[PDB]
Structures are given as C-alpha cells and as structure tokens.
Design a binder for this molecule. Structure first.
Ligand SMILES: [Zn+2]
Ligand SMILES: [Zn+2]
Ligand SMILES: [Zn+2]
Lengths: 499, 250, 86
C-alpha cells in the first residue's frame, strides 16, 4: 500500500492513507487478532508473533493487551521453571533457572519483538513476581537463596572454578538481584555470610569480595553497601594493623613474651553485623592475660577514644596437646581453648571446676563439652554420657587420628533458624525504622493526607527496599501516637495532622 | 483532698467520682458570678495544689536519681508525666490542665538541666535512638532545654561526617566524597525525622554542621570540595559504558 | 602439658568519647596530661594548655605535640590537625 502510495500521492498523504488503512484492517479486526493473541504467545510462535506485534504496534489500543498476554505467559513460564527445583542444589538452580527464563526472553524480546521497551518492561513486571515466588502463609526464601548462591561461589571450593569464571557468573547474578523486592533482607543475610567468609578466612580471594561488593554498589546505590564496604576496608587494613602492633613490641623498652604474633581482626562495631549476643563473662587465660593488655595498651597509643569490646565467641586459635605419642596440632576456639587449660591444671575435673575457671554461661559451657564429647577428644567418666551437674571427665588419650591438623569446628557455616528468625525480625525492625521515617517526612510536606494516599506512596517510596505490610505501617502510626509525633484527625480517621 | 491525691499518686485509687464532684463544686458555686468564675477555685484549691505537687515531685525527682541513671530516669519521668495527663484530667477542672503539667515539668526536668545536659552528650555519641526521643520531649517544654542538644548533635555530625570523608582513596575520590556526605545526610535526616520529631531546630543544626565538613579546608591549602563535585558530575554525565542508565543518572 | 600458641582474635572497636575528657591522655582536659601526671613536681602545672583546632577537639598541648611525632592526623577524625586558639 505504501509502494502504491509512493508512486501516486503526495508525501503529506503517506501517513493518512496507511493510518486509515490500519484503521480498517487491524483496528476493525482488533478483536479477531485478540482472539488468538493469547494462543500466539502460549505457543511462542516467533515469526507469527512479530507480524501480530507489528500490526498491534500501530494500533493505539492493540499493544497493551499483547503486553499483558506476554506478561502472563512469562509469569506462566517462570513459575514452571522454579517449582521443580531440587532441595539439595536449590541456590545454584534458582539463580540459573531465572537466568534461563530471563535469558531466552531477553533474546525473544530483543530479536523478534524489535526490542520494545514496554515489552521489556513487561518482562520486568512479570518476572518480579516469578522470582518472588512467596508460597501462601509462608516466607519467600529468595533473599536467603541469593545469599546462599553468592556465598557458595565465594567460598574456596574443592571443584575450584577459575577467577575469571566468577566475574561473568556474578554479572548475570546482578540481573536476578535487580528483581528481588527484598533487598534489605538480602543485605542482612549477605552481611552474616560475609562475616563467616572474613573472620575465618574462608573466601575464594580478597579481590573477589571487593569485586562482588562493588557490583552490589553499582546495583543499589552506596547506602546499600556502605556497611559491607566498611567490612572490607577493616578486613583489608587489618594486615597492616598486626604488623604495626609487631613494631610496637619492638618499640617497647622490655621484651614481652606471649604466644604467636597477633592476627587481630579489629572491626568497626557500627557497621559490622556482629553483635554481643552472648553475655557470658568469659575470662581470658592467665597465660593470655598479659597478651591482651599489651595490645590494649598499644591501641591507646596509635588510636584514641576507642575502648574495644573484646568479642570471644568468634575468637579461635591453636593449642599443643603434649600428652600423646607424637605432637598434634588442632585449631580450637577460645571457649574450648580455655577449658583445655583445666586439663593441663588437673586431669580430674568436674562441671563446677569449670564454673570458677571461665565464668561462662551454662549453655556455652555445655556446647564446649558437646563439641568435645562428639569428637571423642575427652571422655565423660560419668556413667551417663548426657549433661549433668557433676560432669566428671578427663582427657581421652585414645584419640590417635592420623591427621596432623584438624579443626574442632562447631556449627559455623551453618544457618541455625533461631538467629535467622532473629535476623528476619531484625530486618522487620529495620523495616519499621525506615517506615516511620517516610511517614513523618510525608507529614512534614503537606501535614494533611488521607489514609490511601499516605499508604500508596510509601509503597512507591520503599519499593526499592521491600514491600511494607499495611498492618506494619499501621503500627508505625500507633508508635508515633505513643511518642506524640503523628496525630490522626478526629473528624475523620482518614485524615492525619501534626503534633 | 490532696491527701487523696497524694495517695492516688502513691499507687492506690480513691473514689474519683467523689473527688471530681468535690473539685468541680469549688467552681460551680461561682457560676452566678459575672467576673472571675474560677477565682474561688484558684485561691482556695489550685494554689495549695501547685505548692503541694511542687514539694512532692521535687521530692520524687530527688528520690529517683539515687538508684537510677539517665537511661532509665527519663523513662520514669514520661511515666509520671503520662499519669499526670490522666490524673488531672479526671480530678481537676479543665482550666488547670496546663499549669499542673507545667509545674510537674518544673520539678522533674527544669530543675535537673545540669544532670540532663551532662548525660545529653553521651546519648548522641552512642546513637541510642530509643532513649534520645525521651530526652527530646523532656527538653521540648523547657525554655532552655533544646538549645544544648542542638549543639551536641551538631558537634556529633561534624565529628561524624569528617570521619566518613577522611583518607579517601584517590582511585575514585569524587564518588567516595559525594556518597559519604550523602549517607551522613541520609542517615541523620532519617534519625531526626524518626526520633527527634523532625524538628526544624535540629535540621538547621544538621545543615550548619554539614557546611563545615564540606568546607573543611586542608592546612595550607584550599577546600577541595568545589573541585571534587565538579569531577563527580563529569564521572556520570560522560559517555561511559559502565552501566549508568538514563534513569540512574537522573 | 597443654601449651597455647595461636590466638585468632576479633575485637570490635567503637567510640568512647566522654564529655570534656582528654582523648589521648584518658582523663579530664582540665587536669594534667599523662606525661605530666607522673613527676608532677617537675612540671609547673600550667603547660597542659587546652589545645584547639578545626577538628573542634580539646587536648593538652603535650598530647598532639607527642602525637605529631608519629602522625600528623587528628585521632578522633582522620584529618590533618590544626591549631586555632590557645
Ligand atoms: Zn592529654
Ligand atoms: Zn603536661
Ligand atoms: Zn579532630
């Protein structure tokens, strides 16, 4: 029709002829094309869909129905590829399952759908609910799954994928992370997994963590990774800190005797996810007592106004168990390190003999022997092997394992649901903290808003963070009522005012 | 009458219907008077009540600091000041609502500004968000309670923004400098809007404090901020392939 | 005999700035500096002048002068130190 129009009519009439042409062949038959429009997307007939797309592009009300049809089918396609995921390799599967769906649909939209932005935006809207497959009356495991997937690749592995392999893998991982709707949930979970990868040194490489953090900063601004970047900064400068303290020992008037040279991992308490959850008054050993005071005295020389909080539940080390036929070397945590000094003091030892030795809580004291009885390093001399008030035991000399080095590993690198629920509650506490900020700031602008307008824009303002529950928001008003900050209107509870 | 109020302040509950009718009787008698209908109510009941509650809350405030630090003394003050919003509302004529509340503050927060301002500094530097709100409402009513917490927050932000804009790596100095001040502004605007009611007097302190950290000139040099922000605008408006979509740039 | 060699240790650091306290000397600014705390008879109990700077932190004059030998940076904020008053 254009080729007919080129050779006959004026150029100003080129558009009107073909617009009225589409007005009478695809606008009148718009419902006829809409009939198989659902079918043409479910079957994913590529070349047929493009011809449908080209005609529907010219229609002023022909494209959004096709946009919805693709969105539902991508939603239908995305759900199928995520339901059958195995329980064993779920974090590896879930990211790759989304990328397989996302990769072919980007390949679909860019190639045969002419790369339309609305169709691309349809994929963004459709896949957002796909990755956030929250089962009813449950919690979405996607932020934990992406945390596990990133942590699985970031650990040093027996398979040992190459350094360049992670970077291309992590780049596609960001695309999945762009649709998570729970970025704050991932932040707390990734911070804990970054901790277990940093104190214990269980990381693939130092620069891999920097690359991983920097890619996160490119995805969610700077305030999302500021705590994580502060973790990387402290863990990187800590190498210089130990050398700097080693100069202080040589800078002292008298030589100081202690164990090995310190490998201290001083971290900023403000941004690190580590928290003094245990309140046990764990005393340091007398052999180790002067070791701490020298570093404390040094820290007041090269720093000021600091007053370290001595974390102990993540403090580890070694001990020479000189009681066997040949010397053995074992990595030991400091909770189980101090109780071994009782063995050197006296082979006979009861539970109450450790009470006046470490001054720790009964749960952490139980966990020390529970980490010693299962490894048969010690032998519970009582008739019953369970926990009891007496707990008389000695040193089990029968341990003669062929390994010259073995850690006493507790449940580190595992995820106990108690603290995860606390972390999830902590995330919800952070959710409540930010929700109150938006509420007062919205009231700081107009001072009078209805309930629906106040509710809706907070969803929009916090969309990049999470999806705040309406009941969670309604609690925040009640807190500001209790703190005499917000005031709902007496004439109508819909409206709100200022205190 | 105060003895049944002092006992009411002591934990027990007397007949509030009997009490309220008696106190309302002191003003209902003068209902036929053309001028000063509360004159008999004030000169017979209110002045002895304010004097009695003046000597009791001064006694009570001194009785609390002996076994309580500022972190929990402020909690109990709002506990008493919330009871006073209830106690006088059902025991007195409504025209004496403010003066009993105002005098209650005059013996618990206004007579202990030296103790509060001494512990005001330690609240800000440890960022106790829960206990900072209690200090704000106490010092809001006092005519000279607010202008000290303004200085402490300003000298804390000025001591905090300087920390975040220090020892910057020369690799990405403009982006590090801009995003450091933004998060210090971003965190404290969230902190003021949540905890300190988003008060206007505190935003001026934050604005003035952030002026010092941005214009923190190096010794024997010039302020590097006006050049650094120019280089930050270059680092994102340039034709660069490091992502930086059009929505992200705006 | 059990003997401990390795002590892999982590300690969180925070800020402990109590009001009107010499951050380096770990005492009140109005008192004598820790160098002048010992052998007080040698000192005249006046040279511990309350220093000031653009960092708006107060110490004795013996603190920063001893601190400047090691590094030219203020301890509380990691920026270069100046003198503004006496
Ligand atoms: Zn000093
Ligand atoms: Zn001195
Ligand atoms: Zn300073």
């Amino acid at each position: 029709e254009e080729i007919r129009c080129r050779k006959y009519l004026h150029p100003s009439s080129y558009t009107k002829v073909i617009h009225e042409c589409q007005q009478r062949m695809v606008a009148d038959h718009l419902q006829f094309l809409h009939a198989e429009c659902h079918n043409i997307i479910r079957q994913e007939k590529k070349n047929d869909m493009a011809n449908m797309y080209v005609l529907l592009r010219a229609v002023s009300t022909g494209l959004p129905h096709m946009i919805q049809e693709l969105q539902n089918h991508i939603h239908d396609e995305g759900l199928r590829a995520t339901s059958n995921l195995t329980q064993e390799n779920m974090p590896t599967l879930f990211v790759e399952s989304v990328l397989e769906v996302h990769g072919k649909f980007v390949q679909l939209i860019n190639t045969v759908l002419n790369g339309d932005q609305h169709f691309m935006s349809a994929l963004d809207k459709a896949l957002t609910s796909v990755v956030n497959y929250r089962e009813p009356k449950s919690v979405c495991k996607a932020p934990e799954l992406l945390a596990k997937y990133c942590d699985n690749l970031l650990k040093k592995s027996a398979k040992g994928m190459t350094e360049n392999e992670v970077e291309d893998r992590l780049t596609s991982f960001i695309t999945v992370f762009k649709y998570i709707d729970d970025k704050d949930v991932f932040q707390k979970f990734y911070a804990r997994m970054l901790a277990k990868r940093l104190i214990h040194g269980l990381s693939m490489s130092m620069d891999s963590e920097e690359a991983m953090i920097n890619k996160l900063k490119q995805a969610c601004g700077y305030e999302f990774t500021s705590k994580l970047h502060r973790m990387y900064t402290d863990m990187s400068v800590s190498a210089d800190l130990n050398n700097k303290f080693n100069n202080f020992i040589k800078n002292q008037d008298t030589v100081i005797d202690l164990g090995i040279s310190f490998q201290i991992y001083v971290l900023q308490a403000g941004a690190w996810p580590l928290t003094q959850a245990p309140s046990s008054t764990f005393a340091i050993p007398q052999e180790l007592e002067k070791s701490v005071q020298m570093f404390e005295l040094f820290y007041s020389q090269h720093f000021s106004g600091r007053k370290l909080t001595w974390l102990h539940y993540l403090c580890t080390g070694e001990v020479k168990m000189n009681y066997l036929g040949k010397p053995y070397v074992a990595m030991v945590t400091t909770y189980q390190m101090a109780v071994l000094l009782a063995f050197n003091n006296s082979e006979t030892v009861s539970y109450k003999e450790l009470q006046d030795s470490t001054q720790m809580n009964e749960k952490e004291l139980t966990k020390t022997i529970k980490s010693l009885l299962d490894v048969k390093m010690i032998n519970h001399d009582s008739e019953k092997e369970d926990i009891d008030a007496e707990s008389s035991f000695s040193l089990n000399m029968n341990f003669s394992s062929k390994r010259t080095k073995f850690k006493i590993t507790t449940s580190m690198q595992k995820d106990t649901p108690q603290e995860m629920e606390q972390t999830r509650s902590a995330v919800d506490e952070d959710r409540k903290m930010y929700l109150q900020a938006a509420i007062v700031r919205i009231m700081k602008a107009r001072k009078v808003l209805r309930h629906n307008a106040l509710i809706q824009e907070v969803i929009s303002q916090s969309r990049a963070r999470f999806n705040p529950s309406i009941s969670m928001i309604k609690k925040c008003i009640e807190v500001l009522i209790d703190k005499q900050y917000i005031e709902r209107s007496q004439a109508s509870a819909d409206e709100y005012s200022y205190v | 009458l105060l003895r049944e109020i002092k006992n009411d302040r002591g934990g027990e509950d007397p007949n509030q219907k009997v009490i309220h009718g008696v106190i309302n009787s002191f003003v209902h008698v003068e209902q036929y008077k053309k001028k000063f209908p509360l004159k008999f109510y004030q000169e017979i009941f209110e002045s002895p009540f304010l004097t009695e509650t003046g000597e009791y809350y001064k006694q009570e405030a001194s009785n609390l600091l002996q076994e309580s630090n500022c972190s929990q003394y402020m909690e109990k003050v709002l506990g008493r000041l919330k009871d006073e919003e209830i106690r006088c509302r059902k025991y007195l004529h409504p025209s004496s609502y403010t003066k009993v509340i105002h005098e209650c503050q005059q013996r618990m927060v206004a007579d202990h500004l030296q103790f509060l301002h001494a512990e005001c500094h330690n609240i800000i530097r440890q960022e106790k968000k829960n206990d900072m709100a209690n200090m704000y409402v106490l010092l809001r009513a006092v005519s000279t309670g607010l202008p000290h917490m303004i200085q402490e927050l300003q000298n804390h932000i000025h001591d905090e923004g300087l920390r975040a804009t220090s020892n910057l790596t020369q690799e990405n100095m403009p982006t590090l400098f801009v995003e450091s001040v933004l998060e210090v502004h971003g965190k404290f605007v969230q902190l003021i809007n949540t905890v300190l009611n988003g008060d206007q007097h505190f935003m001026s302190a934050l604005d003035k404090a952030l002026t010092s950290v941005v214009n923190y000139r190096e010794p024997k040099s010039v302020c590097k901020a006006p050049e650094l922000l120019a280089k930050y605008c270059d680092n994102l408006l340039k034709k660069s392939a490091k992502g930086m979509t059009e929505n992200e740039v705006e | 005999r059990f003997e401990v060699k390795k002590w892999n240790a982590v300690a969180l650091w925070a800020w402990d700035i109590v009001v009107d306290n010499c951050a380096i000397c770990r005492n009140h600014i109005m008192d004598l500096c820790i160098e002048c705390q010992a052998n007080q008879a040698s000192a005249t109990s006046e040279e511990c002048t309350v220093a000031w700077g653009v960092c708006n932190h107060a110490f004795h004059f013996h603190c920063i002068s001893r601190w400047l030998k090691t590094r030219q940076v203020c301890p509380l904020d990691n920026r270069e130190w100046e003198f503004q008053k006496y």
